Structure formats: C-alpha cells, structure tokens
Scaffold this motif. Sequence first.
Motif, PDB file in Angstrom:
ATOM      1  N   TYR C   7       0.853  -1.181   0.000  1.00 57.58           N
ATOM      2  CA  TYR C   7       0.000   0.000   0.000  1.00 57.58           C
ATOM      3  C   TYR C   7       0.889   1.230   0.000  1.00 57.58           C
ATOM      4  O   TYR C   7       1.745   1.373   0.875  1.00 57.58           O
ATOM      5  CB  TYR C   7      -0.936   0.011   1.208  1.00 57.58           C
ATOM      6  N   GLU C  63     -13.005   0.606   3.372  1.00 61.39           N
ATOM      7  CA  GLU C  63     -11.757   1.037   2.752  1.00 61.39           C
ATOM      8  C   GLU C  63     -11.714   2.546   2.594  1.00 61.39           C
ATOM      9  O   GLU C  63     -10.675   3.169   2.820  1.00 61.39           O
ATOM     10  CB  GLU C  63     -11.579   0.360   1.398  1.00 61.39           C
ATOM     11  N   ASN C  66     -11.079   4.039   6.059  1.00 56.07           N
ATOM     12  CA  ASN C  66      -9.721   3.835   6.548  1.00 56.07           C
ATOM     13  C   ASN C  66      -8.666   4.550   5.717  1.00 56.07           C
ATOM     14  O   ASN C  66      -7.524   4.662   6.168  1.00 56.07           O
ATOM     15  CB  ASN C  66      -9.387   2.348   6.593  1.00 56.07           C
ATOM     16  N   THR C  73      -4.340  11.914   8.879  1.00 50.08           N
ATOM     17  CA  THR C  73      -3.111  11.726   9.641  1.00 50.08           C
ATOM     18  C   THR C  73      -1.923  12.320   8.900  1.00 50.08           C
ATOM     19  O   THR C  73      -1.084  13.003   9.495  1.00 50.08           O
ATOM     20  CB  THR C  73      -2.879  10.243   9.920  1.00 50.08           C
ATOM     21  N   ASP C  77       0.479  15.458   9.894  1.00 52.11           N
ATOM     22  CA  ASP C  77       1.901  15.142   9.943  1.00 52.11           C
ATOM     23  C   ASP C  77       2.713  16.095   9.084  1.00 52.11           C
ATOM     24  O   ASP C  77       3.879  16.356   9.387  1.00 52.11           O
ATOM     25  CB  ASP C  77       2.142  13.707   9.487  1.00 52.11           C
ATOM     26  N   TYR C  99       3.528   0.452   3.320  1.00 51.62           N
ATOM     27  CA  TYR C  99       3.513  -0.696   4.209  1.00 51.62           C
ATOM     28  C   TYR C  99       3.015  -1.888   3.419  1.00 51.62           C
ATOM     29  O   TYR C  99       2.770  -1.785   2.216  1.00 51.62           O
ATOM     30  CB  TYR C  99       2.648  -0.443   5.447  1.00 51.62           C
ATOM     31  N   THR C 143       9.560  11.377  16.564  1.00 50.82           N
ATOM     32  CA  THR C 143       8.467  10.499  16.183  1.00 50.82           C
ATOM     33  C   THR C 143       8.668   9.147  16.839  1.00 50.82           C
ATOM     34  O   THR C 143       7.714   8.538  17.326  1.00 50.82           O
ATOM     35  CB  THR C 143       8.392  10.331  14.657  1.00 50.82           C
ATOM     36  N   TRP C 147       5.946   6.958  18.891  1.00 52.49           N
ATOM     37  CA  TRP C 147       5.503   5.646  18.445  1.00 52.49           C
ATOM     38  C   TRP C 147       5.978   4.526  19.355  1.00 52.49           C
ATOM     39  O   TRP C 147       5.548   3.384  19.179  1.00 52.49           O
ATOM     40  CB  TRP C 147       5.975   5.391  17.016  1.00 52.49           C
ATOM     41  N   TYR C 159      -1.957  -6.151  12.294  1.00 50.62           N
ATOM     42  CA  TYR C 159      -2.348  -5.908  10.912  1.00 50.62           C
ATOM     43  C   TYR C 159      -1.366  -6.525   9.927  1.00 50.62           C
ATOM     44  O   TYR C 159      -1.782  -7.068   8.901  1.00 50.62           O
ATOM     45  CB  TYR C 159      -2.457  -4.410  10.651  1.00 50.62           C
TER      46      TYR C 159
ATOM     47  N   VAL E   1      -6.252  -5.124   3.076  1.00 52.63           N
ATOM     48  CA  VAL E   1      -7.008  -3.891   3.210  1.00 52.63           C
ATOM     49  C   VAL E   1      -6.136  -2.793   3.800  1.00 52.63           C
ATOM     50  O   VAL E   1      -5.022  -3.045   4.251  1.00 52.63           O
ATOM     51  CB  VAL E   1      -8.255  -4.103   4.068  1.00 52.63           C
ATOM     52  N   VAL E   2      -6.662  -1.579   3.808  1.00 52.87           N
ATOM     53  CA  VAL E   2      -5.917  -0.431   4.363  1.00 52.87           C
ATOM     54  C   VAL E   2      -5.911  -0.547   5.878  1.00 52.87           C
ATOM     55  O   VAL E   2      -6.926  -0.920   6.476  1.00 52.87           O
ATOM     56  CB  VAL E   2      -6.545   0.881   3.893  1.00 52.87           C
ATOM     57  N   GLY E   3      -4.827  -0.169   6.517  1.00 53.70           N
ATOM     58  CA  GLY E   3      -4.703  -0.247   7.967  1.00 53.70           C
ATOM     59  C   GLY E   3      -5.401   0.870   8.667  1.00 53.70           C
ATOM     60  O   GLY E   3      -5.280   1.999   8.221  1.00 53.70           O
ATOM     61  N   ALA E   4      -6.150   0.571   9.699  1.00 53.49           N
ATOM     62  CA  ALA E   4      -6.806   1.545  10.579  1.00 53.49           C
ATOM     63  C   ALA E   4      -5.847   2.276  11.506  1.00 53.49           C
ATOM     64  O   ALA E   4      -5.852   3.499  11.464  1.00 53.49           O
ATOM     65  CB  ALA E   4      -7.757   0.780  11.427  1.00 53.49           C
ATOM     66  N   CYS E   5      -5.050   1.576  12.299  1.00 53.22           N
ATOM     67  CA  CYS E   5      -4.216   2.230  13.350  1.00 53.22           C
ATOM     68  C   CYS E   5      -3.240   3.263  12.792  1.00 53.22           C
ATOM     69  O   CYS E   5      -2.744   3.049  11.684  1.00 53.22           O
ATOM     70  CB  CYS E   5      -3.341   1.218  14.059  1.00 53.22           C
ATOM     71  N   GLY E   6      -3.101   4.389  13.497  1.00 51.03           N
ATOM     72  CA  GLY E   6      -2.145   5.445  13.082  1.00 51.03           C
ATOM     73  C   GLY E   6      -2.008   6.443  14.212  1.00 51.03           C
ATOM     74  O   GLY E   6      -3.084   6.930  14.662  1.00 51.03           O
ATOM     75  N   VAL E   7      -0.804   6.848  14.564  1.00 52.12           N
ATOM     76  CA  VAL E   7      -0.669   7.754  15.740  1.00 52.12           C
ATOM     77  C   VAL E   7      -0.198   9.170  15.312  1.00 52.12           C
ATOM     78  O   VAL E   7      -0.589  10.121  15.937  1.00 52.12           O
ATOM     79  CB  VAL E   7       0.319   7.155  16.762  1.00 52.12           C
ATOM     80  N   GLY E   8       0.595   9.258  14.260  1.00 52.20           N
ATOM     81  CA  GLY E   8       1.016  10.591  13.802  1.00 52.20           C
ATOM     82  C   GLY E   8       2.350  10.917  14.413  1.00 52.20           C
ATOM     83  O   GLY E   8       2.552  10.551  15.570  1.00 52.20           O
ATOM     84  N   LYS E   9       3.151  11.702  13.701  1.00 45.89           N
ATOM     85  CA  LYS E   9       4.562  11.948  14.139  1.00 45.89           C
ATOM     86  C   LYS E   9       4.572  12.739  15.454  1.00 45.89           C
ATOM     87  O   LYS E   9       4.305  12.118  16.493  1.00 45.89           O
ATOM     88  CB  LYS E   9       5.252  12.691  12.985  1.00 45.89           C
TER      89      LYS E   9
END
Lengths: 107, 100, 274, 117, 9
Positions: C7, C63, C66, C73, C77, C99, C143, C147, C159, E1-9
């Motif tokens: 992706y 889709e 998401n 995001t 960013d 990813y 970052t 994270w 995932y 599928v596209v990933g849901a989780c994301g936190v941001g820099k």
Amino acid sequence: MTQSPSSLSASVGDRVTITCRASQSVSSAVAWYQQKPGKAPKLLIYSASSLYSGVPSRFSGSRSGTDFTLTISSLQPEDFATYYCQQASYVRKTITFGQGTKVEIKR
Amino acid sequence: SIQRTPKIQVYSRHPAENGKSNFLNCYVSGFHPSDIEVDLLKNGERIEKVEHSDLSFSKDWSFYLLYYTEFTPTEKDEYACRVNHVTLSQPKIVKWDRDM
Amino acid sequence: GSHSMRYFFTSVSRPGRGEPRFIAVGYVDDTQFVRFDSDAASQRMEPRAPWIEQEGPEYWDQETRNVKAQSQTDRVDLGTLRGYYNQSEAGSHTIQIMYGCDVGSDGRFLRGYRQDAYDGKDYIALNEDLRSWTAADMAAQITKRKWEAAHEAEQLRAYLDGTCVEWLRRYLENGKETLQRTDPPKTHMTHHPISDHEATLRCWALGFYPAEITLTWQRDGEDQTQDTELVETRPAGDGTFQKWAAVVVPSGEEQRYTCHVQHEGLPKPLTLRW
Amino acid sequence: EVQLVESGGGLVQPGGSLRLSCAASGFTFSDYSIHWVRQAPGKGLEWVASISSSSGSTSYADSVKGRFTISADTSKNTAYLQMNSLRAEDTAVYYCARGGWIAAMDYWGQGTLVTVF
Amino acid sequence: VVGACGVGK
Ligand SMILES: *CCC(=O)N1CCN(c2nc(=O)n(-c3c(C)ccnc3C(C)C)c3nc(-c4c(O)cccc4F)c(F)cc23)[C@@H](C)C1
C-alpha cells in the motif's frame, strides 16, 4: 475446526499434546486458553507459538501444516483443565473457539 | 529537499505495425517531487484523450507514471512525449523510435 | 511462488492551494487493485482490478473510511514535520508511506513492512522484527518516542501478520487467473547497424509477468554488464511488462554474442543469439 | 491493574431484553477491543460479539447477529451488550474479555449468568 | 485492506 482429542487422561509427568485443525486461520490469530472449572479462561499461547507473560515454560505451541498443537512438556498437578484453541478470521470478523479438550488424571 | 529528474521511456504496448492499433506509453520514472506534467504528442500536437496511471513510488521514494494513449501508427506520423518537471529548465521531448 | 501486498500513500502539501493532495494505491504483487485520489469527485476507494469489484459495498465503505483517515493523519503530519524541520509554511512537502506484507507459496506470513519518508528521504521504518523503529535523522527521533510511548509497533503488528496475510490470500484466490499467472517473455533479437564497423544488438523481452526478469549480454561466457544499455522494466500497459538489453558489438563480430533471459515463467534460461 | 467487571444479567423470559455491562478499569479503553464470550452450561466457550472502541467496529457471532448489539460508552469505561429476542439457547455465563494487540483475549472478567426462562 | 491504526509523528 476440530480439536483433538475430545478428552485425554494423563498422569503427572507425561507430555500431552492437544491439536486444533484450523485450516484457514493465520497462525497469528491462533491462541490457546485454559479454563479451570467455574473460572474465567486464561491465555497461554498467542500467535500459535508465543508464550504469554507468566505462563510456565512447559507450555508450548507449534504448527505442523494446517494443524496447530499445544504441548505441555512435562505435566504438573496444575494443568488438569480444559484447553481451547481460538481462530480469528479477519475477512469474516469472527473468533471461533475450539470445542475444548479436557485433561484428567490416570488410575 | 533533494529533487531527482525523471527518466522518460516512450514505447508502444505491442510491436509497432503500421495500420494496427496499439497504445503509446510514456513511462516517466525515478523523479521527485511528484508534480510532473506529461504530454503525448502526435506530429507536434498534444494528444487529448490520454490516461495516466496512479501515482506510486519505488523503493527509493521516487515516483513513476504511465501515460498511455491509443494510436494507429504509420510511416507518416511522428510521435513523442513532452515532460516538464521542477528539475527540468525546459520540457524534454522524447521522440518514439519504433526500435527503442 | 512468494506473493506480496503493498500500500503506497503519497501526501503532498500545497500551501495556498487547498488541502494536501493524497493518493493511495494498493498492489497485489505488481497489480494495482485499489485507488484513492483526494482530487477525484468520487471521494471513495475505487477498484482498479477486475477481481476486486466483487467485494461488497461494506468493503468499499470500510476502505474509504480507513483511507480517508490516513489522509487526515498525513495532513497533520505535514504540519508537524514542518515544525520538526523548521521549514517555511509556504513550501510543498511530501510524505510517502509504504507498508504491506509478504506471504509464501503456502500462504504463510514471511515479513511485514512499514516505511515512511519525508521529502524523498527516509524518515522512519519498522524493523524486521516488527517491534522496533529505525529513525533516519534527528527529527524522526521525536516520532520514534511517540511511536514507542504509544506502542504503535504493537498495534500495527496484528495488521501486518493477521489482516494483510488473510486478505492477501483472499485476493490471490479471487484473482487466481490474474495474479497467480506467469507469462514468459516473448524474446527476440534485433540488429541495428549504426556504422559499417559498429553495430548494436538489442535483446527484447516483451509481454512477461511478473516484472522480475534478468537480461545478461554475455560474450564467450564472461558476462559484460558494461557497454550495455539495460532499460528499466517498463509496463506494457496490459498487465505485462517489457525490457530490452543492448550491446554495441562491432560489425562483422555479431555471431559470437549471446543474450540470456531468466524469468520465473521460463522453464530454464534462454541463450538468444543472431 | 487491568480489571474487567461484568454485571447486569439474570432471570429473563424468552423474547425479552437484557443489558449486560462490563465496567473496564486499568487501561485506555480506546486502545483495545472488548469481546463478549459465553460458556453455555456444561458446553464450551462460544464467542458472541465484539466491539472496537476506536472506529466502533462491531462484529457478531452470526447466531446472535440481528438479536445482539454491542454499544461501548468510551467516556464511561464500559461496554454494553443489549440482547433482544432472547431464546432459551442464550442462557450461559457471559464473559467480557480484552483483545490486547496480540490477537488474543488476555484479560477476562468473571461471568454474568443469564438464565432465560 | 488499508490499515486503521495510526498515531502521527
Ligand atoms: C493498523 C491496525 C489494524 O488495522 N488492525 C487492528 C485491528 N484489526 C482487527 N480487526 C478486526 O475486525 N478484528 C475482529 C475480528 C478478527 C473478529 C471479530 N471482531 C473483531 C473486532 C471487532 C475486534 C480484530 N480482532 C482482533 C482480535 C482477535 O483476532 C482475537 C482476539 C482479540 C482480538 F482483539 C485483533 F487483534 C485485531 C482485529 C485489524 C484490522 C488489524
């Protein structure tokens, strides 16, 4: 899925193997639980091989083909309970628990 | 930050046979940033009905695109591809050799 | 027989001209199958493969939801990193994200990827053990702490080995006649005389799939790899690829050169000659 | 630290509603999922329904699909399970568990006995 | 599928 055997009787010292025939699960979503009578289950092996924090090292989980196996390397008088394998489907968004396998005592 | 210039490849989807319909591709790759302007030319005239693929990138974070148009080649015609970019002072006119 | 699902997310800020342009692309192998352009009127995830158009409207509703979340995001960013790097507020900056996962011939998980990039340079990557990050500079160390404090590599773990490996086998099953095919190259050799004493032999490989090919212009065994254009594999446009490799053989010396083609759709390497 | 307490189920007639609640305490509720698992009397563990606190993604067992619904009040640290049109086959002990990023229900509750009469 | 989780820099 089918969990085999339905019930095995083993003695303190033996190496017991419970097998779970998930045929469409991703090893990652294959966990192994242990429920003692009248108590909430207790996670043992997640991702089909990874021990959970605090669970004794005798428990291990493997995968020989489309067949996930729980092993108690040397049985101790705290492991006599019912062991459930789960399998989650991310496409169908379902967790399915195995029928369960009861470990009991010998003569 | 660091800008890398595109690499243009003008070709045809099928081997060029005068009179049979193929597609003229203009594959620009290895450029950064993603703001590019690609034009397929027929005898020095911009071709209107041109599709381009969706902007993706390689392992080294540089982009690539494919601008294809359907054309029926012959001896008379001259085809090319005009590419403009932040790294190019003037547009790059890559003609189409039947032999590449 | 290894397969992969990737992706690619590209968010390019355009100050003074609206919201950062966001493009998302998905690829089962070298076959784009989904799409999202923020400038398109649909504002939905669109199918770009014939075997994905069978997924129900619940798949496309999810889709879209998401991919419009990664859109936001990346939108915050771009202004975040613009302060990490202390850059002006009137410049265009890019955030590329890639990813995905790799499964084997038996559909078992091999490895998972998650790599970010700010302005073409590497920014942060997910280590191969899938629980560590590689911060590429001094503004990705900030970052990295976020994270790690937020346990982002642990939430993302489920995932990359359970949701990609499961939907990827769903894709390899639906698109079985498309993604699980190997088109062998249509190889031929063309002699272009450039001088009375100099010539060039081009070794084509047309219509092959997948794009992983190798053309090697040997000469009496010792491969040259020099004086040899070997253009990048280019898309033919119909799911197949093209690639040629030339050599600048002197005239009167052509019938001693061999071109060797290696492709996973070939029973064994070829030895095209003239 | 991570404690799940479920309460709200008991005697109920068929074709009626119950609301089981599971007051989670010990973690950020929006980071994990809450699963409802039932152990039919004598039978084995059955997964009933699930909630993803972030994005509100529900999922049901397809035997409770149209009859059970999970809500999750994020600003209460609680996940609910409204069980409409109860059958005599819905009597069980209901546990709420926590999906802990490892695709396993690491923390469990104690149980809420729902007896349909 | 596209990933849901994301936190941001
Ligand atoms: C970037 C992170 C990401 O996209 N992922 C985390 C969330 N996730 C995921 N999705 C999902 O639908 N389920 C799930 C399943 C498989 C079955 C029933 N309900 C659900 C949701 C509503 C919780 C996920 N389930 C788990 C999970 C399993 O499989 C087993 C026990 C406990 C669990 F929480 C999970 F870890 C992640 C789930 C995907 C999209 C990956």
